[PDB]
Write a protein that binds this ligand. Structure first.
Ligand SMILES: [Mg+2]
Ligand SMILES: [Mg+2]
Ligand SMILES: [Mg+2]
Ligand SMILES: [Mg+2]
Ligand SMILES: [Mg+2]
Ligand SMILES: [Mg+2]
Ligand SMILES: [Mg+2]
Ligand SMILES: [Mg+2]
Ligand SMILES: [Mg+2]
Ligand SMILES: [Mg+2]
Ligand SMILES: [Mg+2]
Ligand SMILES: [Mg+2]
Ligand SMILES: [Mg+2]
Ligand SMILES: [Mg+2]
Lengths: 60, 354, 107, 61, 153, 50, 63
RNA sequence: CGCCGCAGGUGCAGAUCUUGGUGGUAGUAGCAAAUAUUCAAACGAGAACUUUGAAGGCCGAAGUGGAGAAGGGUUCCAUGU
């Protein structure tokens, strides 16, 4: 789960996550929060684990 | 009313041998601590020695649990206490002339023997270590002897902290702000009978005015800094946690529920380390801490270049003189200070013993 | 003795006479509580839940004419309360009320 | 340990973009620490890194 | 703080005070005049009787529309009531007053309410809604209370 | 309503973020003269402009 | 102490109404510790929450 | 501030005067549309009103039910006061 820019579409979020974190993502769901910030649920590839990607990001 | 105490001679004996184990593992730690070693390696081998020794002792009563009462914590010149790096975390390399501070705890029947010591590594045989770091360890050692001498039921708890402040001002040092020693009963390291050192207005009013009572266990703990007395955080992961059995909450995570169950099986009531688990443990610990099911033991830092020393040990209170079951290997022959004690009471207590 | 237990029959019809339809059954339990206060001298009266059902068995206005209760003076078991004794009023089902006297019930 | 525009002006475009990229990575980690508790030291470094990003971009432009 | 009617012997006197207490001024004034000059034990028993409706306070000044009662014949009056909130507030102030008495050291078995006064506190404002789109006040009338007890026997 | 435009939702987002108490440390600032948020809005009491 | 959340959760887990939810009056503290639907499921399995039967509306008189 | 001169947005009881404040009325009118509550326990300083259980009732499928449109805009949901 990420807080992304309000102008970024699903394609931009998909490429940004791949470039910044060197992982492959399956799909991106997008909503805009009531406070105005866009939130992206970024599902990862089956061969990638979100648990240890969260460790290397530092949000565990 | 059903809680156990030192009234049993079998409790006396298991205190002594558990303290002897705690002393022999500090001795093996201080001998193994040479240049080029890793603090992570030292902590994992120290806890491995504790686990096998506790398993091999008291094998005739295995309904209870014997093991770690406090994880092996090794802090070096910048960390106050509660330090235990993980495998994924960065390591520290030990160099020449660095003073390191090791805390350790062993338990039987939930009753706990606790001990710490500060010592410089790679010290040449028979030589002298000087500097502003060589008097903070001496003042802390005099604090440990002060606690040993005057620990006796019939004294006010405030006499301890004023004595430590007096010897600190004599040595031009100060204690660590808001450090608490504790009274130790069965499966308890956070006893309500607590001793404060370096207080302020806010902590003094939160403290309790109490008098020491006969036939119990104490863990006198002194933390002396040669600097100013500032302890904060610089973004290091907190590893040591302790379960709080008074509170509970409905966990919403499967991994946090499994992690909490693992705490119940292994370290149910006493502090532990995340090293014993780690990929799922780091996730399962933050949500339990968020709902205050585990009390974090935060790592503390000071300004770079300052130096702190720890000295703590369990002391048994019996009316015919208190006794020591855990001791740290310190020698004043190779350690001297540039400033001496000028108080008559302080020089009297270090001379006299029970 | 203050741990006494007795059987009483309360003329609910007598004490409810004149009360309106929507106040009859609630007034019956106030008169039962007053009955226990007078008979046992205890300010604290606890109506049993089965007796509450018996009073309300036929609705809010068609309260039974007679009820057979048992009054039990007991120690409060809570020293913090002002009252040393309380009366527990239980329900006693009876086929008929003829020739029924106020009797003493042993332990 | 700071970055000055005075000594940035000798740098080429390639290493200027490298220095900007490292600052952006550092800031993204500082935003991570901000929402995961972090520390007062890392929170106060957010403005310093943000100023450094502005400094590098000003010299580039 | 500056009381009115400073005690003749401040050594043998204890003081209690409350401000902006959310009770009716008119009810509390009548209750205060009833317990004035009473012994501390007698006033405590009297205020407990008022809440139980065994003794009543006579409404002498603010008696517009106040009904009659049989217990008002204890006083030389006909109108009386049983202000529960006023009796409970004065009971709290009496417990505070006697607690100040043990703190000063004078014994509490001979205290007499020599002074008691109810002042009007600043009004709190609320609204009520009337027939033709009108808003009218629904103000509260809180009160300050001060009392002085004195040792005498 | 559930159906809304992006412009309206963005407007309500700003009003939501704006409707919050002032920080406690503001009272300690030098020459504050601020007691409480005078622009606090409740949904039932005062309606928004739109 | 206040089992409004637990009664609401139990009705959704049992797929019945709050009329038909029976929380144990003796194990009030055990119910109050359940803040998730899965905890409600454990209580239902362990007999601390029972789905009450339908009120009898017989058709014997009609038949 | 007094004295010699100078200059006025220079004197209040009214104007169903303007603004602000406060009384008597007055602890008064009143808190009366749609049948209805009761017992026990828990938490809690405190319970007619909260919660749970047991009763007795009402809406009676054109509902006091389950969902939506417009409108509201966080009222949603946990915890705490
Ligand atoms: Mg969408
Ligand atoms: Mg009149
Ligand atoms: Mg109206
Ligand atoms: Mg209108
Ligand atoms: Mg409206
Ligand atoms: Mg004029
Ligand atoms: Mg005028
Ligand atoms: Mg005028
Ligand atoms: Mg005129
Ligand atoms: Mg009236
Ligand atoms: Mg009325
Ligand atoms: Mg009907
Ligand atoms: Mg509907
Ligand atoms: Mg709600």
């Amino acid at each position: 789960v990420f807080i992304v820019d309000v102008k970024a579409n699903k394609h931009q979020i998909k490429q940004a996550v791949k470039k910044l974190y060197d992982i492959d993502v399956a799909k991106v769901n997008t909503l805009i929060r009531p406070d105005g910030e866009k939130k992206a649920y970024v599902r990862l590839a089956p061969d990638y684990d979100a648990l240890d990607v969260a460790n290397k990001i530092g949000i565990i | 009313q059903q809680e156990q105490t030192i009234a049993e001679d079998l409790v006396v004996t298991k205190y002594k041998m558990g303290g002897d184990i705690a002393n022999r593992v500090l001795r093996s730690l201080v001998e193994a601590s040479s240049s080029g070693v890793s603090v992570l390696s030292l902590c994992e081998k120290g806890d491995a020695m504790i686990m096998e020794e506790t398993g091999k002792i008291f094998k005739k009563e295995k309904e209870m649990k014997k093991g770690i009462a406090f994880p092996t914590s090794i802090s070096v010149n910048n960390c106050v206490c509660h330090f235990s790096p993980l495998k994924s975390d960065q390591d520290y390399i030990l160099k020449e002339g660095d003073l390191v501070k090791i805390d350790l705890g062993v338990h039987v029947d939930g009753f706990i023997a606790n001990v710490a010591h500060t010592f410089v590594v790679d010290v040449a045989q028979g030589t002298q270590v000087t500097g502003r770091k060589a008097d903070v360890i001496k003042a802390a050692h005099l604090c440990a002897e002060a606690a040993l001498r005057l620990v006796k039921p019939g004294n006010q708890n405030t006499q301890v902290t004023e004595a430590w402040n007096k010897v600190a001002h004599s040595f031009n040092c100060t204690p660590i702000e808001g450090m608490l020693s504790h009274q130790l009963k069965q499966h308890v390291i956070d006893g309500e009978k607590t001793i404060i050192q370096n207080p302020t207005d806010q902590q003094k009013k939160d403290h309790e005015k109490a008098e020491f009572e006969v036939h119990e266990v104490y863990a006198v703990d002194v933390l002396v800094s040669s600097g100013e007395g500032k302890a904060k955080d610089a973004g290091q992961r907190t590893t040591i946690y302790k379960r709080d059995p008074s509170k509970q909450y409905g966990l919403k995570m499967k991994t946090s529920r499994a992690f909490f169950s693992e705490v119940e099986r292994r370290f149910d009531a006493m502090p532990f380390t995340l090293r014993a688990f780690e990929k799922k443990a780091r996730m399962g610990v933050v949500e339990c801490a968020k709902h205050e099911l585990l009390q974090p033991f935060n790592v503390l830092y000071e300004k770079e270049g300052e130096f702190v020393a720890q000295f703590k040990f369990t002391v048994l209170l019996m009316p015919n003189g208190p006794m020591r079951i855990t001791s740290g290997p310190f020698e004043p022959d190779l350690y001297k200070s540039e400033m001496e004690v000028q108080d008559a009471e302080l020089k009297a207590l270090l001379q006299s013993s029970a | 003795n203050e741990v006494v237990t007795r059987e009483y029959t309360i003329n609910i019809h007598k004490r409810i006479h004149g009360v309106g339809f929507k106040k009859r059954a609630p007034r019956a339990l106030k008169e039962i509580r007053k009955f226990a206060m007078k008979e046992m001298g205890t300010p604290d009266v606890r109506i049993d839940t089965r007796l509450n059902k018996a009073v309300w068995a036929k609705g809010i206005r068609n309260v039974p004419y007679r009820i057979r209760v048992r009054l039990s003076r007991k120690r409060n078991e809570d020293e913090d309360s002002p009252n040393k004794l309380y009366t527990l009023v239980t329900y006693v089902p009876v086929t008929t009320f003829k020739n029924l006297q106020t009797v003493n019930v042993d332990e | 340990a700071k970055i000055k525009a005075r000594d940035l002006r000798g740098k080429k475009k390639e290493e200027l973009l490298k220095q900007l990229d490292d600052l952006k990575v550092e800031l993204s980690q500082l935003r991570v620490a901000k929402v995961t508790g972090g520390a007062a030291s890392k929170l106060s470094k957010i403005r310093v890194v943000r100023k450094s990003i502005a400094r590098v971009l000003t010299v580039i432009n | 703080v500056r009381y009115s009617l400073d005690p003749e012997n401040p050594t043998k006197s204890c003081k209690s005070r409350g401000s902006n207490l959310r009770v009716h001024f008119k009810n509390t004034r009548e209750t205060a005049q009833a317990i004035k000059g009473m012994h501390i034990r007698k006033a405590t028993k009297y205020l407990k009787d008022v809440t139980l409706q065994k003794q009543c306070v006579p409404f002498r000044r603010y008696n517009g529309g106040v009904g009659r009662c049989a217990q008002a014949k204890q006083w030389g009056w006909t109108q009386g009531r049983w202000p529960k909130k006023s009796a409970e507030f004065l009971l709290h102030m009496l417990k505070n007053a006697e607690s100040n008495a043990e703190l000063k050291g004078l014994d509490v078995d001979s205290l007499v309410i020599e002074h008691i006064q109810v002042n009007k506190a600043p009004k709190m404002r609320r609204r009520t809604y009337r027939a033709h789109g009108r808003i009218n006040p629904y103000m509260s009338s809180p009160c300050h209370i001060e009392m002085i007890l004195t040792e005498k026997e | 309503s559930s159906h809304k435009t992006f412009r309206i939702k963005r407007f309500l987002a700003k009003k939501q973020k704006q409707n919050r108490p002032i920080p406690q440390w503001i009272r300690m600032k030098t020459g504050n003269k601020i007691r409480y948020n005078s622009k606090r809005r409740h949904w039932r009491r005062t309606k928004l402009g739109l | 102490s206040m089992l409004r959340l637990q009664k609401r959760l139990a009705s959704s887990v049992l797929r019945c109404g709050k009329k038909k939810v029976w929380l144990d009056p003796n194990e009030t503290n055990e119910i109050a510790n359940a803040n998730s639907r899965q905890q409600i499921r454990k209580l239902i399995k362990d007999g601390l929450i029972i789905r009450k039967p339908v009120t009898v509306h017989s058709r014997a008189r009609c038949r």
